[PDB]
From Swiss-Prot, chains A, B:
S-adenosyl-L-methionine binds at residues 5, 13, 24, 49-50, 70, 92-93, 108. GO terms for molecular function: protein homodimerization activity; S-adenosylmethionine-dependent methyltransferase activity. It comes from the Bacteria. It is an enzyme of class 2 (transferase). It catalyses: dTDP-3-amino-3,6-dideoxy-alpha-D-glucose + 2 S-adenosyl-L-methionine = dTDP-alpha-D-mycaminose + 2 S-adenosyl-L-homocysteine + 2 H(+). However, it is not conserved in related S.venezuelae DesVI methyltransferase and its mutagenesis does not completely abolish catalytic activity. The lineage of its organism: Bacteria, Bacillati, Actinomycetota, Actinomycetes, Kitasatosporales. Signal peptide: none annotated. S-adenosyl-L-methionine-dependent methyltransferase involved in the biosynthesis of mycaminose, an essential structural component of the macrolide antibiotic tylosin. Involved in the last step in mycaminose biosynthesis by mediating dimethylation of the hexose C-3' amino group. This is dTDP-3-amino-3,6-dideoxy-alpha-D-glucopyranose N,N-dimethyltransferase. InterPro entries: Methyltransf_25, SAM-dependent_MTases_sf. Belongs to the methyltransferase TylM1/DesVI family. Keywords: Antibiotic biosynthesis, Methyltransferase, S-adenosyl-L-methionine, Transferase.
Amino acid sequence: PQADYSGEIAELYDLVHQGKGKDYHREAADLAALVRRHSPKAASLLDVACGTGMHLRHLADSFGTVEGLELSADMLAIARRRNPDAVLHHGDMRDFSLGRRFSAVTCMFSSIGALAGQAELDAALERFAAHVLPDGVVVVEPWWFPENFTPGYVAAGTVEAGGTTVTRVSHSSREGEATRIEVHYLVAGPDRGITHHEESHRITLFTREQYERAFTAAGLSVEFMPGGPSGRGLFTGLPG
Amino acid sequence: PQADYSGEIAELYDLVHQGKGKDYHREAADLAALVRRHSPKAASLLDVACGTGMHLRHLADSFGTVEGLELSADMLAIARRRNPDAVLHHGDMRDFSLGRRFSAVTCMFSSIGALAGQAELDAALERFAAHVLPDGVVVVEPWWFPENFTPGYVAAGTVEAGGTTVTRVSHSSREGEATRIEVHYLVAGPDRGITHHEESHRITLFTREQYERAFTAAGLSVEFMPGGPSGRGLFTGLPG
Ligand SMILES: Cc1cn([C@H]2C[C@H](O)[C@@H](COP(=O)(O)OP(=O)(O)O[C@H]3O[C@H](C)[C@@H](O)[C@H](N)[C@H]3O)O2)c(=O)[nH]c1=O
Ligand SMILES: Cc1cn([C@H]2C[C@H](O)[C@@H](COP(=O)(O)OP(=O)(O)O[C@H]3O[C@H](C)[C@@H](O)[C@H](N)[C@H]3O)O2)c(=O)[nH]c1=O
Ligand SMILES: Nc1ncnc2c1ncn2[C@@H]1O[C@H](CSCC[C@H](N)C(=O)O)[C@@H](O)[C@H]1O
Ligand SMILES: Nc1ncnc2c1ncn2[C@@H]1O[C@H](CSCC[C@H](N)C(=O)O)[C@@H](O)[C@H]1O
């Protein structure tokens, strides 16, 4: 299985997540209101691990200048197509340097959990702090805390769009201090026939203290609020 | 991919077909009624390619004595558990010889489409007539005809049993004189994780007249009723 968000997996991302019920329009509106709460006059936003650019496409309608960073070229391609007039960088949230700062730096949908341990987490928070304006805000949607993760969780759904049926089923286990989530897809359409795809990801179960440590090492005050877009809450941090 | 109805594919059969809405109770009832129409005092019944023995289990409530014949040892094992007091034979519809005759010889759910070519169809029908009593009836549920099969058809459904989620997705193409149906499964549960399975079959697209000629060569009068249990109609033959 792949772990790199590429190929047909990357192609099926938007369809499966929309079918699961993810509402990027609501999420972007919530996020713009969160940002303006901590930074009333905020005018620009860097979305880190922006994936297919779905958040940016909507954040564009609340913020004058949006920008992305994304490690997977195949995810980035879809995002650039969707956000043709924004700058979207190919790069790595651990070690990136855009030479500018934004009112908000966001990292959504637990993309932070692709990092391996405290050192990587710390390095990414430090980069997020390096790209935020002095009156701005950094927003990170965490993965589950270890005590709130349910090993053995099964998600299964099937959606169809434009002649094609796509079933996605995931199963998750605890693997050391991370979730191993294994995801299988069957994709069937009249002319193309049926194929099976798979991916597999390790998503780190950082504790609240570990996120907090990373924010604080970056010069950011930190606040957690439970709930948020995926039930995992949101951290925000403010420089100074 | 397997073609032989074995292993996990055989274990999944009942759940997926019942999940798809197949009602062997109502089909058994209909079949028993149809049998009696033609042979009012009918007492015994042979189910050829009986698979998991689902029809047999309900036909037992209508006919004094039921028996089956199945090629696949793994399907048959399921059928023997389900029908512990009936005789179920391990054998081939193309050439079996049981030593006795029955009021009804049935062959249901397009099992007859595993045969290729007029010679095999003929052979099977002559065996069915070699096992029917003189006042009894042969019932064969055909596959689609070449004129009414829908190429490109995709089926997808999900069912859950015992904590396990099973998703089955089929694609069907016209592969010459048969339907190629390729079936994929994803099976997931909290304790067992996810597993993928696949089968693929050619199911022969015999014309109406090919079945008619098989029944005729076998000594049976033949009638066709459109619709039937699965949309494909039903043929019935009476020795004579
Ligand atoms: C709702 C719920 C979820 N979970 C965990 C279980 C499983 O690891 C995950 C939900 O699985 P999913 O719905 O198949 O995954 P999701 O759409 O959330 O996407 C997640 O996994 C994919 C692979 C990542 O790209 C994505 N960034 C993640 O959010 O979240 C829990 O532990 N408890 C819960 O109540
Ligand atoms: C609804 C419909 C279906 N079809 C064809 C398309 C496909 O070949 C078949 C439906 O496939 P399915 O629902 O996946 O299959 P089904 O449950 O009927 O099982 C069939 O294929 C399996 C492999 C055999 O063991 C079984 N003996 C067959 O009935 O029927 C048609 O031609 N016209 C139709 O209107
Ligand atoms: N080190 C890294 N730097 C930047 N992006 C990364 C990364 N590791 C993983 N990712 C990206 O993180 C994303 C996780 S999926 C979430 C994508 C998007 N934020 C959304 O909400 O839909 C994928 O696009 C993946 O390629
Ligand atoms: N030559 C042959 N003789 C006997 N059974 C056969 C066969 N070729 C295929 N089969 C059986 O045909 C069945 C098709 S599935 C239909 C099974 C059952 N009649 C039901 O209605 O649910 C499978 O059990 C397969 O193993």
